[PDB]
């Protein structure tokens, strides 16, 4: 007859570290870190995306002639460009503060296109000749499709004076050009005036330009170059046009609802018709973790990114007719901490559910605490600077490096002490329990050392049933262990 | 006879929370988050700041005829602005650089104005006939105070050539303008030439402006517009200006030195004759703890933001013929730790005075470092970026946003952890009493198990406290226990 | 006739704070903060520095007459340049996006000067006029040595027309200028044009100017100005020049290759002739530990800058023949951390327990090993390059650099707090097991005195009392002797 104190155990090989020590087997663990993803591009609260496949923002605005597929797109969370567009602009050119039109034009509530000038409204001015072989269509010249390129008629160019009243009750996006010439020869084949200008005209902007007639290098087989505007019309103002050659005129205009923002995103995946919260280059997460290491670039409420390829939080045992001291009991399967109880009627183990639900509640205390203690917003990531700003860039750099180590190293640590704060806390537990059933059973047994107690005299299994319970009668054996020892 | 340990217990019901456990109750408690706003504007360090009330800083500097009475005020820490002005730019135009300009005119030493080209030095052009009906005064048409326009006299406008020495031992700011016209007809009704330009040269600065016609939206009644510039003069250098038409004349400079950096606050609260050290757009906080969580704009030394509602730390006990484990004595005041002593004399209570001072000096200790290893820096946080700068706000919004998480995150953790090694820190000392006790007792008594020793022989007031005090024969009672054992 | 238990003690006089204490003594502690460098000026992984002494990037590129120091330097790393530079730009003007061509002017992978447009190349214009006084040389006027100046010719100034076409395999570095006029007479007596323009077009490149007359300040005793721009052409590009006057036409060009990316450093430091790894204005560092609180700008892999003086860990012991619960200072035991002094009538000596001293030390060596361990560090070039109409965007540097400083002091200081109060504990918890184990072993044979010792009442000699260290005792063997002494 004796009875022992001591800890479950079981097959489990999963290690984890702490401060002082290394590759330390335990019963049970758990992992705080998101490695995996869908790897598709899926929807934003519901909200498809804008793909723009092979093409580009600038040329999906003012009408590319290859690049006519996407006209039919209400609304858009975000939009997917492509690192190397193909059809960009088929007449060599740029257009005026790119950048922040895109930024402007990632996030958009509501699109329209509709037509402000018809092709009717030019009689003096010819229409019908402003093509180019630099943009072929079905293999004939032709042209951007939202511009017309207006030319000399009857060798005559009379100035060009109109004006637009806005009447809709949303704002306006318009977009218009001037072409460069190559010589003196081809400006007076083209539009018979030496000398030109273009003045536009609003409630904000006033613009004055004049063409740069010089030699250039050969870009897609022409020397010429078209640089375009834009602006923005509010509800009620007008906009007015004055120009005497060189002159490319608008016909659509957009009508735009702003009501958000976002960036662009660079990725080849595919569509994938989902609904997700956080989305990446590579696929979507869903994980309700507090840290990730897929992709640095991410739109929407994501966890934080870091560098570590594992954290694992040890919430078990350490793995290993004895006592505590030697190891943890295999037989016994329910509970975490109990009794092995062993005398002539017979043997089996005991567990002790009132320290183990403790125990249990404790540490998915601690787990649900660190994993909800962390506070999330929306955000967007992307690179939008070109190559003049090279400055600012670095500075976006160094901000994103300098929190990615920040976290890093905070998570590390943190997760390197809690798991020795677990540990002593279990080896704190079982000591409870075992001075616990001590100082009340005195002087009836002798304690061998080994965490188990050799009653003196006879403990019936309704008397250790009451020890377990914690009521015991001393002086009922009292007698019976005095004539006992020796 | 039987000497018990306890600790101490009140009607206290604040409550804290651990990382195992969630607002379990404590008889004292601190906080550590400050939530408390004056409502008012307050001086910054002794300086007064700048209020335009319903102007702007254009509308101040240029002389708006509705707006300025005088200067005042030579110097200023930071500017007050109302979020919608009401008097800016009575004529319609722009200024060049106003963002720059707002933030170099944040925090300025000695503002003085002076005149430096009085109205005699035109003898040859018309200078009282540049008013206007768009800037009325007292129902008359009136214009700039700080500038000069000049008109053509006897149909005639000569070419205009003068320069300034900078005599004085500061700093000049100098601003200029020019106008544009609607039409031809106009220009030369308003000038003879029809063909204008205007140079301005410095040791450092080269301009050439040429007027802009053309057909803009009537704004305020008028079509036409003026741009303004600026420019800081050094202390001996020279300024000359060149034009025949469309030039606006500076009749006044103003004196700058400057020494520091600041921002502009966008605010509608009142001032309030006060003196501060940190600054919100809401009212005025001075404390010393290491959060707060009232706004996120602030200027001075103040302290981090965080998200968090409640932030609390623990500084007592665990509040709930007794033991240590029954929980706390409501009728033993003065101390922490203490024995209850209960003789044939009487029954009273008694406290260690040494591990009380020691408990409350390391509490004391650790609240302190805490709020004082927290290291405070001068800040001027706010909006400086205008509509074609969106990329930078939002870079500036990660920034702050990253900021806040961080500190949001690592303060709920750090509470958290440092309230559970609090809670359990007195639980050591007091079993250390307890077992100092027995080890002084050794087996003269009987433990009840319960946390008190039943006394064999009879331990008067001189004995008991030699026991607290540490001073316990067994010898002279031993005989007395064993015959008393049986 | 007893034992007793203890801890080693020494003479050392470090002095550690925690969380609760102050001024607390300790046997041995660990600093984990740099605070020392050479001083010097030295290679970054084996490439040397670029020194420009006292002159300015512009000025070395456009060839400054005081500049002759022509030393080529086909790799460098990281430029150096004076606080205030003398000879910067000898003629006043100004360079176009002169912040931009500085930053791309970092760490460059090749370089080299060639010839594109010998001064043969026009028959029709002067090009021995082009000096001033204001570019003196050995006391007599000249002008920069990578551009020519035209003048006229012959009372006559023929229109300009000319093209380069790129066939080297490297991408090129060009330079022009524009010259500005004082009045119409010197723009007659220099050029006969009344009005002029310069138009130059590459593939990606178009513009055109147009000079500026007006009176302007006396600089240098010079009232013109200069204005210069800069360009990259393509291995496979060309570029076109077109005009009549005002033109200041580029003679050599530098063939650049670029990888990588670095900044400026401003310091006026001596080279050192070094292969170091992290670089300071005021030395160079070589350590491992992870903070420092040397200088904020640095260059190259460094720890991290805080602003607390002393960071340091404590390893050792509570500093101060009885012990274990009283004033532990066994000075005789210097050969471990925990053990025990004997006392018989054979004689007495200080043993010491081999485990639980390895585990001690083996446990704070791990945590002091990952603590220092467990820095991520990555390459980062801090400087400071923004002009003086770029304020708001050094304004939010600044805030970068001070929240990420602060944040750093605060979180060391508190973790080198909390640990050392964790480890102040290890120690003792260790102690109180030792002397449990020393319990329940001899059970009643002894008697605890309680100030840490144990008094056998039977006789045990050497032998036993090795045993009982090797936690092996016969209790029954000296169990009636303790019945026969207990009176
Ligand atoms: C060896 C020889 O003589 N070869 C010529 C060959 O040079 C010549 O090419 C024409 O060259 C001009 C440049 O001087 C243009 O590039 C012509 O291109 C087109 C185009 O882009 O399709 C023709 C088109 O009709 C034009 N459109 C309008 C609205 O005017 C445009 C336009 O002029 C330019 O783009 C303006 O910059 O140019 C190109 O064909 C050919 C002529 O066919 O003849 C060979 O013999
Ligand atoms: C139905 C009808 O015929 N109504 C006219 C009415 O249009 C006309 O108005 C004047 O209109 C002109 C535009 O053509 C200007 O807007 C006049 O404005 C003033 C002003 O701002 O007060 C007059 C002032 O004297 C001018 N100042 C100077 C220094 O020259 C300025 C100046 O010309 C402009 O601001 C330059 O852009 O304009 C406005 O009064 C009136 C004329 O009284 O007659 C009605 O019959
Ligand atoms: C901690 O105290 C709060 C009381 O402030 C408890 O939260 C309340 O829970 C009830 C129902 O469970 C809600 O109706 C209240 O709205 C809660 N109060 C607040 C302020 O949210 C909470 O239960 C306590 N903690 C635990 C573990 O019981
Ligand atoms: C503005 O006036 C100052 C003072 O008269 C001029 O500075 C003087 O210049 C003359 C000749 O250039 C020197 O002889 C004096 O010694 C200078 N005086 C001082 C105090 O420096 C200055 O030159 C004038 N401005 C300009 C543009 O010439
Ligand atoms: C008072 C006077 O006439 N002085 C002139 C000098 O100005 C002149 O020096 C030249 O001046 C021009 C500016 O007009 C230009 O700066 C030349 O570079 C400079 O050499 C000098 C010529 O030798 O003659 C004096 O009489
Ligand atoms: C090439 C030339 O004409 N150089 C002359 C210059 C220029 O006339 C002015 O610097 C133009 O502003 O002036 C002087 C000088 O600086 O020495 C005399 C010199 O002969
Ligand atoms: C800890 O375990 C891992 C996994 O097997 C192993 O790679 C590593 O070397 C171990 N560490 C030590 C110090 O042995
Ligand atoms: C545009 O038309 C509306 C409708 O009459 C009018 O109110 C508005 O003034 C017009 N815009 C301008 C600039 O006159
Ligand atoms: C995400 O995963 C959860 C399980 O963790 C699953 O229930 C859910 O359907 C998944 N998808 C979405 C959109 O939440
Ligand atoms: C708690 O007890 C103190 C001690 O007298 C008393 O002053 C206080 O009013 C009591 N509080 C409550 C809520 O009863
Ligand atoms: C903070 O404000 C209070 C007024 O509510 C004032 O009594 C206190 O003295 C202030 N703090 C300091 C340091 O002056
Ligand atoms: C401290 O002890 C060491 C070890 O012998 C000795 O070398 C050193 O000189 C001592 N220091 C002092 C100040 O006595
Ligand atoms: C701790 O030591 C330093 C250095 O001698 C001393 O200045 C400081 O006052 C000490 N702390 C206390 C509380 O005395
Ligand atoms: C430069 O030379 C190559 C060599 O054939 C030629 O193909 C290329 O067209 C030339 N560049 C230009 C702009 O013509
Ligand atoms: C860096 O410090 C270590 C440690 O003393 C030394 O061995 C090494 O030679 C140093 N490196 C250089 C380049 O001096």
Redesign the pocket.
């Given at each position: 007859d004796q009875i022992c104190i001591g800890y479950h155990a079981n097959n489990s090989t999963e290690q984890v570290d702490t401060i002082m020590e290394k590759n330390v087997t335990v019963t049970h663990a758990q992992d705080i870190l998101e490695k995996t993803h869908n790897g598709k591009l899926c929807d934003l609260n519901g909200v498809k995306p804008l793909i723009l496949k092979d093409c580009s923002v600038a040329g999906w605005l003012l009408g590319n002639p290859m690049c006519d597929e996407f006209i039919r797109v209400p609304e858009w969370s975000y939009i997917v460009e492509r690192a190397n567009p193909a059809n960009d602009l088929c007449y060599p050119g740029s257009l005026n503060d790119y950048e922040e039109l895109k930024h402007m034009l990632s996030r958009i509530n509501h699109f329209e296109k509709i037509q402000i000038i018809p092709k009717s409204s030019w009689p003096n001015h010819e229409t019908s000749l402003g093509v180019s072989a630099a943009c072929p269509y079905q293999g004939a010249p032709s042209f951007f499709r939202n511009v017309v390129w207006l030319i000399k008629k009857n060798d005559a160019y009379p100035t060009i004076k109109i004006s637009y009243?806005?009447?809709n009750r949303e704002d306006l996006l318009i977009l218009w050009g001037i072409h460069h010439s190559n010589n003196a020869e081809e400006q007076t084949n083209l539009y018979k005036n030496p000398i030109t200008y273009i003045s536009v005209g609003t409630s904000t902007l006033n613009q004055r330009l004049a063409p740069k007639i010089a030699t250039r290098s050969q870009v897609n087989g022409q020397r010429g170059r078209m640089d375009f505007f834009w602006t923005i019309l509010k509800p009620?103002?007008?906009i007015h046009f004055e120009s005497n050659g060189n002159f490319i005129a608008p016909e659509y205009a957009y009508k735009i609802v702003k009501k958000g923002d976002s960036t662009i995103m660079k990725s080849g995946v595919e569509y994938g018709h989902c609904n997700t919260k956080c989305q990446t280059p590579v696929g979507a997460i869903n994980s309700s973790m507090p840290f990730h290491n897929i992709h640095p670039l991410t739109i929407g409420e994501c966890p934080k990114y870091v560098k570590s390829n594992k954290l694992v939080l040890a919430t078990g045992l350490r793995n290993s007719i004895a006592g505590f001291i030697e190891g943890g009991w295999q037989g016994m399967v329910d509970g975490w901490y109990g009794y092995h109880h062993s005398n002539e009627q017979g043997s089996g183990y005991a567990a002790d559910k009132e320290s183990t639900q403790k125990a249990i509640d404790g540490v998915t205390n601690k787990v649900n605490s660190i994993i909800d203690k962390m506070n999330t917003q929306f955000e967007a990531v992307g690179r939008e600077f070109n190559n003049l700003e090279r400055r600012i860039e670095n500075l976006n750099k160094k901000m994103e490096d300098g929190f990615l180590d920040v976290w890093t190293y905070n998570a590390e640590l943190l997760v390197l002490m809690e798991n020795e704060r677990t540990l002593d806390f279990h080896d704190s537990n079982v000591k409870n329990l075992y001075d616990k059933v001590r100082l009340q059973l005195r002087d009836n047994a002798k304690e061998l050392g080994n965490g188990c107690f050799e009653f003196y005299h006879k403990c019936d299994n309704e008397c250790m049933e009451s020890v377990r319970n914690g009521t015991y009668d001393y002086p009922q054996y009292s007698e019976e262990a005095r004539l006992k020892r020796e």
């Amino acid at each position: 007859d004796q009875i022992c104190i001591g800890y479950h155990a079981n097959n489990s090989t999963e290690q984890v570290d702490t401060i002082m020590e290394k590759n330390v087997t335990v019963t049970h663990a758990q992992d705080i870190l998101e490695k995996t993803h869908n790897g598709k591009l899926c929807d934003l609260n519901g909200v498809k995306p804008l793909i723009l496949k092979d093409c580009s923002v600038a040329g999906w605005l003012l009408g590319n002639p290859m690049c006519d597929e996407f006209i039919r797109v209400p609304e858009w969370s975000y939009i997917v460009e492509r690192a190397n567009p193909a059809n960009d602009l088929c007449y060599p050119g740029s257009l005026n503060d790119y950048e922040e039109l895109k930024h402007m034009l990632s996030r958009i509530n509501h699109f329209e296109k509709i037509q402000i000038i018809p092709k009717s409204s030019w009689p003096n001015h010819e229409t019908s000749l402003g093509v180019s072989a630099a943009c072929p269509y079905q293999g004939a010249p032709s042209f951007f499709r939202n511009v017309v390129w207006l030319i000399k008629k009857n060798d005559a160019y009379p100035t060009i004076k109109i004006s637009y009243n806005n009447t809709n009750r949303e704002d306006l996006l318009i977009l218009w050009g001037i072409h460069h010439s190559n010589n003196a020869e081809e400006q007076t084949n083209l539009y018979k005036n030496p000398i030109t200008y273009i003045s536009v005209g609003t409630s904000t902007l006033n613009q004055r330009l004049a063409p740069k007639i010089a030699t250039r290098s050969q870009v897609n087989g022409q020397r010429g170059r078209m640089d375009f505007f834009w602006t923005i019309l509010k509800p009620d103002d007008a906009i007015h046009f004055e120009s005497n050659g060189n002159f490319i005129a608008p016909e659509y205009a957009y009508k735009i609802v702003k009501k958000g923002d976002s960036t662009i995103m660079k990725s080849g995946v595919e569509y994938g018709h989902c609904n997700t919260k956080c989305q990446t280059p590579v696929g979507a997460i869903n994980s309700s973790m507090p840290f990730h290491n897929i992709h640095p670039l991410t739109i929407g409420e994501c966890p934080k990114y870091v560098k570590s390829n594992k954290l694992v939080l040890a919430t078990g045992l350490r793995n290993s007719i004895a006592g505590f001291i030697e190891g943890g009991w295999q037989g016994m399967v329910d509970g975490w901490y109990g009794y092995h109880h062993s005398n002539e009627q017979g043997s089996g183990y005991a567990a002790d559910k009132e320290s183990t639900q403790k125990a249990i509640d404790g540490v998915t205390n601690k787990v649900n605490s660190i994993i909800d203690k962390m506070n999330t917003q929306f955000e967007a990531v992307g690179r939008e600077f070109n190559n003049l700003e090279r400055r600012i860039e670095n500075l976006n750099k160094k901000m994103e490096d300098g929190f990615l180590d920040v976290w890093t190293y905070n998570a590390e640590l943190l997760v390197l002490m809690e798991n020795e704060r677990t540990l002593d806390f279990h080896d704190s537990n079982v000591k409870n329990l075992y001075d616990k059933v001590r100082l009340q059973l005195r002087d009836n047994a002798k304690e061998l050392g080994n965490g188990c107690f050799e009653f003196y005299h006879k403990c019936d299994n309704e008397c250790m049933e009451s020890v377990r319970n914690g009521t015991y009668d001393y002086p009922q054996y009292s007698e019976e262990a005095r004539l006992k020892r020796e």
